[PDB]
Amino acid sequence: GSHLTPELITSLQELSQILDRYDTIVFDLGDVLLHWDSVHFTSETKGIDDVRKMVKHPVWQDLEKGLINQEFALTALSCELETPCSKLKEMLELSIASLQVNPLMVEVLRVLHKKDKQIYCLSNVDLESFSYLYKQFDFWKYFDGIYVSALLQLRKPNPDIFQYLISSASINTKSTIFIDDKSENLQEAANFGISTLKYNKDNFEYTAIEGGWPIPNMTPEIHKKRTLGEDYLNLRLRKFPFCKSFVSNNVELIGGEDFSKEIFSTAVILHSYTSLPDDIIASMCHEILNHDGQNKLRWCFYKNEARPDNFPDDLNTTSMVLSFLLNHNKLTIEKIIPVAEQMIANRNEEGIIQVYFDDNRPRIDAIVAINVLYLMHQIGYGERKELKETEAFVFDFLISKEYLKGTRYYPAPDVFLFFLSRLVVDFPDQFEKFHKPLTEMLITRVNCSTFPLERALRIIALKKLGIVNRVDFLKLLDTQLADGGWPVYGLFIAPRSNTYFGSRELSTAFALEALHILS
Amino acid sequence: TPELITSLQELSQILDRYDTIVFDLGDVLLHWDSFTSETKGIDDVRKMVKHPVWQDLEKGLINQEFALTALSCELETPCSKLKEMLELSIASLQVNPLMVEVLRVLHKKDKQIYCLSNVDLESFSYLYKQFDFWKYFDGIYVSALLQLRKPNPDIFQYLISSASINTKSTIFIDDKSENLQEAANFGISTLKYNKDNFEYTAIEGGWPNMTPEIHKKRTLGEDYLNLRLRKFPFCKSFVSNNVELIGGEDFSKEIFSTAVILHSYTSLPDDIIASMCHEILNHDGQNKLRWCFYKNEARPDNFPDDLNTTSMVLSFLLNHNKLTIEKIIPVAEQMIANRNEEGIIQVYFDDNRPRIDAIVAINVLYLMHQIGYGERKELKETEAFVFDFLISKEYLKGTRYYPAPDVFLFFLSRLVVDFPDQFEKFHKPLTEMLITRVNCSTFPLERALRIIALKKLGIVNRVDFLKLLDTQLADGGWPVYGLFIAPRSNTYFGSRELSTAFALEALHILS
Ligand SMILES: [Cl-]
Ligand SMILES: [Cl-]
Ligand SMILES: [Cl-]
Ligand SMILES: [Cl-]
Ligand SMILES: [Cl-]
Ligand SMILES: [Cl-]
Ligand SMILES: [Cl-]
Ligand SMILES: [Cl-]
Ligand SMILES: [Cl-]
Ligand SMILES: [Cl-]
Ligand SMILES: [Cl-]
Ligand SMILES: [Cl-]
Ligand SMILES: [Cl-]
Ligand SMILES: [Cl-]
Ligand SMILES: [Cl-]
């Protein structure tokens, strides 16, 4: 008998010794951390009765990979399974509503987290189910990274999903064990050198895997597109370190004209793309410091030559600039704190910090509130009680889903979620209640629009929150133009004239950040 | 080392030696005469066409608005100035009168003749409308429709495979050396066009992309469709209030879907054709060779026989030798007795339910020409109805029973291509419309219609075909699609069978 022989495990003490030997543990969700009831007769007798007929149908694979959504999958299945779609939907909702944790295995996960193991979730789940599961259960915080088929356009047991996890997370397979109930997933993982642990009803099957042989994707294309985009952006900003911009009446800036007389794009690029060459940072920083419309560490959007009559300094440009200058050691907190105090003196009747340093131009904007809050927490103002109404404004904007209508100056919903994730992730103790609702919204928006900049925002925000969004990443590659830059995009607007501002530089900087953060 | 040629008589003997001739458009068939500007930015269009972004535009990845927007940034020229220059360039193009005559003669001598050219979609649409040599090509291979461009060897392989070219007897006329160089690598002889002469290289051919995956998907699709129709030869249908039939309920009580499939997908196995033909012949909604859309069990009270089901059924049976023209002609005469006061043939056999529909008129006209009624004078107004519907672009509003514009263009293409002498004036306006619509909607059945109709008109639409491939589900079927509606209640009918049958016809016709 040449077949390897799994060591049977029947005592939690044994399980703990085995698991303690490994640096990295990979969990499945289904029937390891969760269980559910699949049988649901309804008020409708026609058709199937067991949700297992749906999840094992080939169409379910398209759902799992994010190619189709649940409405679409159920339409196809109502035909193939000769069952009214409204019954299929009812069956699926009831099954989903009946899911619970596996108490032993969630406790296992919590303990491995305490012991500072590296823990990853690798699972086939469709996108809307994943959203729901993320909100409903509370073991996600135990994971160092979450790899879900609907965000990957891959599914177990395809070898490519194991290869992508191993590469994405830099896994050393020799000290990695994989817990799953399906034998064909475990066999696929062992052939990558990962040791296996079969989760059975009353036992565990433990197979140590010496491994050692090397590992068999998109990676060559990726390196050339990254290089081509870098070269494109570096040439643009070495030639024009004052970031150019075009104005038009549509988000694609079709027929836009060169404007190039506002400092905010430059600040945005400094603030967001973390791999700029040092010489470009210096030249762009110089444009910030020497900008026309700086008055006593307050910044105006416009160069003086372009400033409309009576156009005030604004808190969005000032917050983002002060925050960048402080992070790069060009200003001290003690110089910034008096300007922050003027921001706190800029609240309106509801207590919300406003957009302009000008009592005759009252406005609020939830992204401007976010970036003001970011600066506040950065300088030590984080517990000033005068911030409470501004934070609640931001919180309700998220929870109410009002952000789906955009803000006054930023129409795209993902921009709000993106700048929010900077605050929620960089100051986690002060923003815990934002973490899950924010991550849940982002999950539901994976691949929901085609604009490269929007794609890139979702990639970066989700990855900073522990979740790998490979789908938006792939489609982001498809839209690089042949000179290596991405298309222009209108990131913000003058709302009364409906003028969009944007640049190829802005799109390309975020696209490269997204490519970098998943590398 | 090329052989320099300056004798027309020689050229004629070189060209007579080849079965297959490939033309480029630039310099070979169209040349230009280059009007200044003191505005800021570039003066010659040469800088746009050599910019890497121009390649995206030629490959059909972006349109002209998009490319001009990027180019206006990289070239620091106002996009409106780039746009004006582009347009003046394209409109100053003129035919090459010698080559157009060479091409007319080769066509009249029965050669196989192809156009292989890098041109963006909107320019091609304009040039297709502007000039009248397109009719001498057997197949037009344009980069914006292929998502390939010269001189990459992929585009030559695609052409050789797509048109089944024997390179031994093929010669390529072009004026760029790198294009000819690449063609030679495939065994194709070259004729470099200069203004004073041709350089001719004879090259010995005759020696032997995504074909692996295409085959799997075609096999998977055929297996899905064959299983569905072996199990339900009365083609099923679902109904709902939206084109995707989200929320749709099984209906399967109308015969027209079965007729559409028999009529449109030409590779069904013999046994499925027989069972489905049996459903047509046994349909109880039938009365003296007129058909009703509904089974009797579902017929609404006083619902009449209609010319759309009847025309399509009679046409299919005549074509599959189940009925004779002599039995059909008295039904055709009843259709001619069904004109409204404007002289247009109506939808229903019932003077109390007066309706017209441009697709019903098309399928009636098709039957008429098939049976020898093609010159009856009573058809004149119905034909003018269809023509005005096309030319006026009113078809973009859909017809009464078919909301999707490509459905009208697709059924028109069958008529126009199957009876080419009676519909000449339709050919170019119809091909123009279809060209501007390449890749303009996501629905698979619509993609498929544009692919099939364009190929029948001699233009290879690979853009729509590649996107078609991505929407197949893992069981081999494409998603359900609402092909027609009961307009007063706004009910869509459709099936996965219909979507799948058309998608497979599209894959087959480009194979
Ligand atoms: Cl639970
Ligand atoms: Cl959690
Ligand atoms: Cl997969
Ligand atoms: Cl500059
Ligand atoms: Cl400090
Ligand atoms: Cl406001
Ligand atoms: Cl707002
Ligand atoms: Cl904190
Ligand atoms: Cl023509
Ligand atoms: Cl190329
Ligand atoms: Cl049947
Ligand atoms: Cl006959
Ligand atoms: Cl009518
Ligand atoms: Cl109509
Ligand atoms: Cl004819």
Numbering used by the authors:
A (entry chain A): -2 to 0, 19 to 231, 234 to 536
B (entry chain B): 20 to 53, 56 to 229, 234 to 536
Article passage:
In this study, we determined the co-crystal structures of drimenol synthase from Aquimarina spongiae (AsDMS), which catalyzes the conversion of farnesyl pyrophosphate (1) into drimenol (2). Crystallographic analyses of the enzyme bound to substrates 1 and drimenyl monophosphate (3) demonstrated that the TCβ domain catalyzes a class II cyclization reaction initiated by protonation, whereas the HAD domain catalyzes a phosphatase-like dephosphorylation reaction dependent on a divalent metal. Our results demonstrate that AsDMS is a bifunctional dimeric enzyme, comprising a protonation-initiated sesquiterpene cyclase (TCβ) domain and a metal-dependent HAD domain responsible for the stepwise release of phosphate to produce compound 2.
Because wild-type AsDMS possesses a long disordered region at its N-terminus, we truncated 18 residues from the N-terminus to generate AsDMS d18. We determined the crystal structure of AsDMS d18/D333N at 2.30 Å resolution. The asymmetric unit of the crystal structure contained two AsDMS molecules. Gel filtration analysis was conducted to evaluate the oligomeric state of AsDMS and confirmed that the major peak corresponded to the dimer. The obtained crystal structure of AsDMS represents the first experimentally determined structure of a HAD-TCβ enzyme, revealing distinct substrate-binding pockets for the HAD and TCβ domains. Among the top 20 identified proteins, only AsDMS exhibited structural differences within the core region of the Rossmann fold, notably lacking the conventional C-terminal α-helix involved in typical folding and instead possessing an additional N-terminal α-helix. In the monomeric state, the domain pockets are oriented back-to-back.
